[PDB]
Amino acid sequence: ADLKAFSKHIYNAYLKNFNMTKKKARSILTGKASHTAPFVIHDIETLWQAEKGLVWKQLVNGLPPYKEISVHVFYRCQCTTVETVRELTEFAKSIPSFSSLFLNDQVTLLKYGVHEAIFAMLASIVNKDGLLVANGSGFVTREFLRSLRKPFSDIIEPKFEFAVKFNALELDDSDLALFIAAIILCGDRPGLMNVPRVEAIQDTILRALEFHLQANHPDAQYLFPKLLQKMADLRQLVTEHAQMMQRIKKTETETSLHPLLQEIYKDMY
Amino acid sequence: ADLKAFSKHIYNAYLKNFNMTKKKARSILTGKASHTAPFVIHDIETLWQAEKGLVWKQLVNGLPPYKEISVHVFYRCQCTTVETVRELTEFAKSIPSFSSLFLNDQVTLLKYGVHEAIFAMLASIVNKDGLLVANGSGFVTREFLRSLRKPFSDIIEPKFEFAVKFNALELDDSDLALFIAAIILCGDRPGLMNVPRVEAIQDTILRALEFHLQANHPDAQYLFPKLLQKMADLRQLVTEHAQMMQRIKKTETETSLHPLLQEIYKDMY
Ligand SMILES: Cc1cc(Cn2ncn(-c3ccc(OC(F)(F)F)cc3)c2=O)cc(C)c1OC(C)(C)C(=O)O
Ligand SMILES: Cc1cc(Cn2ncn(-c3ccc(OC(F)(F)F)cc3)c2=O)cc(C)c1OC(C)(C)C(=O)O
């Protein structure tokens, strides 16, 4: 009660804001709802094919001018990330009392949380071998992404490592809704004004998550503490990511960075 | 139709979000809605009377600990201003294409625009003699405010100086809606991401304003350039105000600043 309602409201916000759920993604990856697989990108040729219709169906990509394969893929990563951020902000608007914070605090929370949330949600569209892209019309292999030149392969691999370990907790969409809401409502964010309010909201979300997990996964007893540890793991994974991003900006000078990402990484830690 | 439609929608946002319009204020200040005037505050006694129900109807002031009349009035100033910031934020959300900017840009625009807008709208509740407070239930005299000790009287007087000259343009609420929308949609704000989008929106607002002025004030010809100059004046007024605010923080160590105002003033330019 109250937590059941809270959980359901968060879940519905999740379902309303994310086109690609873990449900849909698993359904595609196992082959039960499609009957014809997504287009597999695993090399230069198939990437080129995918960009002329098979996966992205426009005759000029509307991405920055690229001079090599690795940077092209990096730009694709930026596109996915930007649209996930967009969805995450819209999702945050439906969290109880998020919209009632100061606008500045909303911006702070999103700035410092979206990457943690993105890395958590990636596991829904990732398996050992690769990841879904373009709402599941494409599947990019992990071996291809490992084959990109340093430092871009270096940035991509850790997300696979984390996602594969995170998928072993076998959460479903209704768990993940509460998990990512709690990621966003973090009181530890630099420059937050109303820390106690945000901590109280996170308090509620996490109580609802504990409740929801005992209902949904009766036999997994220690699922809740591990998930809290997952949050801490995510923070460090983002720290490492940010370090590599710094190195990119230093050493890959005309690799362009989307303005939203320039803002997020601006002054970050 | 095009600019008439834009204008009217801005006007409706204005009418839906500001408790005190120039219409209401002039009706109260001239004595037409009154039959008996607002409670005049011009010294400590009337301030004490007003704070126990007559004007502010609470039995604990909920203001920070203050040790003098000047700081007490400064805190009242903060309260009025914070509520105006809240109203302006809601008003900006209803401006066409404001809500469509990145949240970072919305926050930047409000951060650097609210004081300019507040100083413009202050003229609606001011005459030579004082100003309305608490939705027109109170009237605080300018001579009382001059009687506060430096630096507080110093910060307040220039707003009167500006407002009295601004009231000589005989604008009405429907002009002011477009004027303050244009103040907020400033492309010149430090740290704006999408400058051209904001400048296009402001262009629309300003064209609508010129059109609306040609309809509403046919015979007052140089009104539009003068208003452009008013915007520049407001910028200079906010520079001076902010300088004085700095000297407050340097030299009035027992004076607290509301957190939202602390945010606006931290790192401003
Ligand atoms: C580098 C990065 C990766 C991820 C996850 N990720 N990993 C691979 N892809 C991917 C690969 C190929 C593709 O298509 C095609 F290229 F055609 F193969 C479409 C998408 C992802 O979305 C997440 C964040 C936050 C990243 O950091 C950035 C974006 C820089 C940032 O936030 O600034
Ligand atoms: C110091 C200042 C003044 C103004 C205008 N102004 N002048 C007087 N009042 C007022 C006076 C008396 C009253 O009631 C009673 F106290 F009882 F008399 C209630 C309201 C205003 O609102 C505007 C800004 C931005 C100010 O600067 C601050 C707030 C720090 C800031 O930076 O935001």
Side-chain angles (χ1 to χ4, degrees):
Chain A
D2 319 283
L3 287 199
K4 175 131 167 97
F6 193 91
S7 287
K8 204 143 192 161
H9 177 85
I10 299 307
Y11 187 30
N12 290 330
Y14 177 97
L15 292 176
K16 214 84 183 48
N17 281 285
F18 300 106
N19 234 6
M20 180 58 73
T21 68
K22 186 167 182 180
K23 219 209 174 157
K24 191 173 297 258
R26 294 314 154 184
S27 147
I28 291 168
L29 298 199
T30 61
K32 206 126 80 191
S34 267
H35 202 185
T36 297
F39 180 69
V40 179
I41 302 168
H42 73 284
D43 61 70
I44 295 159
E45 263 299 333
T46 53
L47 172 57
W48 185 75
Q49 304 196 15
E51 304 264 5
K52 282 174 23 81
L54 275 77
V55 176
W56 297 281
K57 301 73 55 171
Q58 186 182 13
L59 300 179
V60 185
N61 51 31
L63 293 114
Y66 60 86
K67 75 152 43 149
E68 64 169 283
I69 184 55
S70 295
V71 165
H72 184 30
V73 172
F74 197 62
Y75 291 168
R76 300 254 59 111
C77 300
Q78 291 191 44
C79 261
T80 319
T81 301
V82 162
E83 259 75 51
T84 312
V85 171
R86 292 228 159 150
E87 290 176 321
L88 274 164
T89 63
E90 223 44 55
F91 167 78
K93 255 265 151 186
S94 321
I95 297 171
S97 296
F98 183 84
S99 289
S100 87
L101 300 155
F102 292 130
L103 259 204
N104 35 289
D105 281 340
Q106 296 179 42
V107 164
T108 300
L109 288 186
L110 287 166
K111 203 182 93 102
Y112 289 102
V114 285
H115 277 334
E116 294 180 21
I118 283 162
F119 296 154
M121 298 177 82
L122 262 196
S124 301
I125 57 167
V126 160
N127 63 36
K128 64 265 177 192
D129 278 10
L131 69 146
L132 281 184
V133 306
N135 279 270
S137 47
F139 179 83
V140 184
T141 79
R142 187 180 182 178
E143 221 197 51
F144 180 59
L145 301 175
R146 286 157 98 145
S147 86
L148 308 186
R149 70 165 166 95
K150 284 194 165 212
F152 285 122
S153 59
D154 289 322
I155 324 189
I156 288 175
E157 219 306 313
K159 282 90 224 170
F160 265 95
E161 272 162 15
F162 178 92
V164 161
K165 287 148 76 163
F166 188 82
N167 275 338
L169 298 175
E170 263 159 25
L171 320 177
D172 65 28
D173 295 301
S174 64
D175 311 325
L176 287 148
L178 291 164
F179 187 65
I180 76 184
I183 289 174
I184 293 162
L185 278 288
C186 168
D188 216 327
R189 302 311 189 190
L192 258 191
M193 266 164 53
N194 198 348
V195 164
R197 185 66 176 286
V198 170
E199 287 185 322
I201 299 171
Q202 198 197 33
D203 192 30
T204 305
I205 300 165
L206 297 174
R207 311 246 188 127
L209 175 61
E210 176 185 60
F211 172 85
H212 183 77
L213 288 177
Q214 323 144 10
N216 203 9
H217 304 293
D219 295 348
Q221 288 284 348
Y222 302 88
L223 195 49
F224 182 73
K226 287 148 119 183
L227 269 43
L228 295 194
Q229 182 61 50
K230 283 317 183 202
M231 286 171 74
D233 299 346
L234 280 158
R235 184 176 247 106
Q236 177 104 343
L237 170 74
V238 168
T239 311
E240 297 166 0
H241 185 88
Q243 279 158 4
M244 303 195 203
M245 284 301 282
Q246 292 326 307
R247 188 233 204 234
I248 308 300
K249 293 179 179 179
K250 192 123 184 63
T251 320
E252 299 290 347
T253 49
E254 223 74 23
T255 299
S256 148
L257 195 55
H258 189 289
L260 183 33
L261 304 186
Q262 281 228 72
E263 191 55 39
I264 288 156
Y265 288 114
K266 204 165 222 88
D267 270 299
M268 187 171 190
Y269 291 117
Chain B
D2 48 330
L3 295 180
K4 256 189 279 195
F6 194 83
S7 303
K8 215 98 213 196
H9 177 80
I10 295 305
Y11 190 27
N12 291 325
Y14 179 99
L15 293 176
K16 183 178 179 180
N17 287 285
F18 295 102
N19 274 354
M20 187 53 71
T21 64
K22 187 165 181 185
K23 195 211 199 106
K24 185 173 176 165
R26 244 68 203 162
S27 276
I28 290 171
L29 285 174
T30 60
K32 295 184 222 253
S34 323
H35 254 278
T36 283
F39 182 42
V40 176
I41 307 168
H42 69 297
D43 53 24
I44 316 93
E45 61 142 343
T46 52
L47 180 43
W48 170 74
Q49 309 186 2
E51 292 229 346
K52 214 42 161 203
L54 278 76
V55 173
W56 299 280
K57 191 179 125 21
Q58 189 186 344
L59 286 147
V60 53
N61 61 19
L63 285 148
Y66 58 84
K67 74 182 58 190
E68 57 188 291
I69 180 56
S70 303
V71 173
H72 184 187
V73 175
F74 192 62
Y75 287 168
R76 287 259 143 252
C77 281
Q78 287 189 53
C79 295
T80 316
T81 303
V82 157
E83 222 276 308
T84 307
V85 174
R86 296 193 182 266
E87 290 179 324
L88 277 164
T89 306
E90 294 306 302
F91 164 76
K93 295 180 159 176
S94 324
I95 292 176
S97 303
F98 184 84
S99 211
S100 90
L101 310 161
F102 291 132
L103 253 72
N104 316 77
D105 283 337
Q106 299 176 47
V107 170
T108 294
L109 288 188
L110 286 165
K111 185 212 230 270
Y112 290 100
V114 282
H115 279 94
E116 289 179 15
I118 285 158
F119 292 156
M121 296 184 79
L122 209 59
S124 289
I125 61 170
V126 159
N127 61 39
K128 215 41 192 178
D129 284 349
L131 79 150
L132 280 190
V133 301
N135 286 303
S137 47
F139 180 83
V140 185
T141 80
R142 185 181 183 173
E143 212 73 11
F144 173 61
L145 298 170
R146 284 164 167 176
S147 89
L148 311 180
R149 74 169 169 86
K150 295 192 179 281
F152 298 102
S153 52
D154 281 335
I155 330 175
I156 294 167
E157 245 304 288
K159 283 86 224 176
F160 275 99
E161 272 161 20
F162 179 91
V164 160
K165 292 160 193 150
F166 189 84
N167 280 334
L169 296 185
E170 305 228 79
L171 310 190
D172 64 44
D173 290 306
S174 70
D175 310 324
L176 289 163
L178 297 168
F179 184 71
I180 68 184
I183 289 172
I184 291 159
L185 277 289
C186 188
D188 229 332
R189 306 306 188 191
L192 260 189
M193 271 151 54
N194 201 353
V195 167
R197 186 62 175 127
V198 167
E199 292 187 326
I201 301 172
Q202 190 190 36
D203 216 27
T204 307
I205 298 167
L206 284 180
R207 290 148 184 286
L209 178 56
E210 191 175 57
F211 172 67
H212 183 88
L213 286 182
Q214 293 163 295
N216 205 359
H217 304 290
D219 309 316
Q221 256 314 317
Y222 288 93
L223 196 47
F224 187 70
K226 289 160 148 202
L227 278 186
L228 292 191
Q229 183 63 236
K230 287 315 186 198
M231 285 167 83
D233 298 346
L234 282 163
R235 182 85 63 78
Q236 187 53 37
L237 182 61
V238 170
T239 303
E240 298 164 358
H241 186 86
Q243 282 166 3
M244 293 202 257
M245 280 303 288
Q246 300 140 25
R247 290 216 64 50
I248 304 288
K249 305 182 227 95
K250 186 45 165 157
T251 75
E252 295 290 343
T253 182
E254 312 262 48
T255 305
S256 56
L257 193 49
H258 188 292
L260 196 68
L261 306 185
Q262 206 170 333
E263 187 52 38
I264 283 158
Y265 286 110
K266 215 39 163 205
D267 317 332
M268 215 200 90
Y269 293 122

